[PDB]
Amino acid sequence: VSIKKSSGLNFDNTAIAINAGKGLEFDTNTSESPDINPIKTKIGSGIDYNENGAMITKLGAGLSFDNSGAITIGYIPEAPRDGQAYVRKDGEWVLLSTFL
Amino acid sequence: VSIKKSSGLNFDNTAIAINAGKGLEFDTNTSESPDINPIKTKIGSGIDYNENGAMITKLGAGLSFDNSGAITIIPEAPRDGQAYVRKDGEWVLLSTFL
Amino acid sequence: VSIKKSSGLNFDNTAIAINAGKGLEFDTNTSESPDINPIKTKIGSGIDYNENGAMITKLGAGLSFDNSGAITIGNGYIPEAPRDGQAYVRKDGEWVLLSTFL
């Protein structure tokens, strides 16, 4: 058999093998391993698989996906300046004299 | 024909095939599909392709690439053992109001 | 010999070749290239390889990996007082009950 070795194939003791380079590996953890190992991507920090085996970015605190699957990002306000003093109650600035 | 099955190839009946696992798939969306499908990476949220067919991180609102291809982006009351309230953008001792 | 052409293989002048599409390429920069090229992923902005060839996200200013490999936001003003129906005043960086002081 002729193989095109410039297109990712090579011989390993006369058997055609995928010659897997950067970002790829053979999955030695399937039910059929180590005799039958599928090729898979090789991934590290910040990448995962979803349920379909698709690569996704691994998002932590502060980050989310928008509506197109793009990565996106995602202290109390000032009381009124009317000369009057304010205290804090149930998430609101409430006039001091309310309690005096 | 001899294939090395522990290196990503398998027989699909009599025919030699790539055995694609996680992060990989066959592209059924070409002109030539379904009879000739290239192997491609399998991608989801957070990843996209370039025009050059390269995988890139898919960035939305608030994130961008820096110039070397990496992803990038009331004051406290006085501390003096006394109680304080908010008035005109200042922190003003409570006592002052009693 | 027969190949499953719907499974990522094709003929190039009789020779069996991987038919590489989006996110893959052959590496022409090896010690046996260009007559022998491995298949590799094809990566651009936001991605790199680690030392062992695994793809990682490339992080710049203000972003960091946490200890579980996830991308996160890297790293005074007052917080909310208690939401318990009571009034509060600020003393020594703590919300203390206005009650105390009357």
UniProtKB/Swiss-Prot annotation, chain B:
Q: Modified after translation how?
A: O-glycosylated; glycans contain N-acetylglucosamine and may play a role in fiber assembly and stabilization.
Q: Where are the Shaft repeats?
A: 1-13, 14-36, 37-52, 53-68, 69-73
* Expression induction: Expressed in the late phase of the viral replicative cycle.
Cystine bridges: none
Q: Which residues carry this modification: Phosphoserine?
A: S7, S33
Cell compartments where the protein resides: Virion; Host nucleus
Q: How does it assemble?
A: Homotrimer; arranged in a triple beta-spiral. Interacts with host receptor CXADR. Interacts (via N-terminal tail region) with pentons.
Q: Main role?
A: Forms spikes that protrude from each vertex of the icosahedral capsid. Interacts with host coxsackievirus and adenovirus receptor CXADR located at the cell tight junctions to provide virion initial attachment to target cell. The fiber protein binds to CXADR with a higher affinity than CXADR binds to itself, thereby blocking the cell-cell adhesion function of CXADR dimers and leading to local disruption of the tight junction. Fiber protein present on neo-synthesized particles may thus disrupt the junctional integrity in order to facilitate further neighboring cells infection.
Domain comment, in the record's words?
A: The tail region anchors the fiber to penton base capsomers, whereas the shaft, built from several repeated motifs, allows the knob to protrude from the virion.
Family stated for the protein in its record: Belongs to the adenoviridae fiber family.
| Remaining remarks | All late proteins expressed from the major late promoter are produced by alternative splicing and alternative polyadenylation of the same gene giving rise to non-overlapping ORFs. A leader sequence is present in the N-terminus of all these mRNAs and is recognized by the viral shutoff protein to provide expression although conventional translation via ribosome scanning from the cap has been shut off in the host cell.
The name on file for this protein is Fiber protein
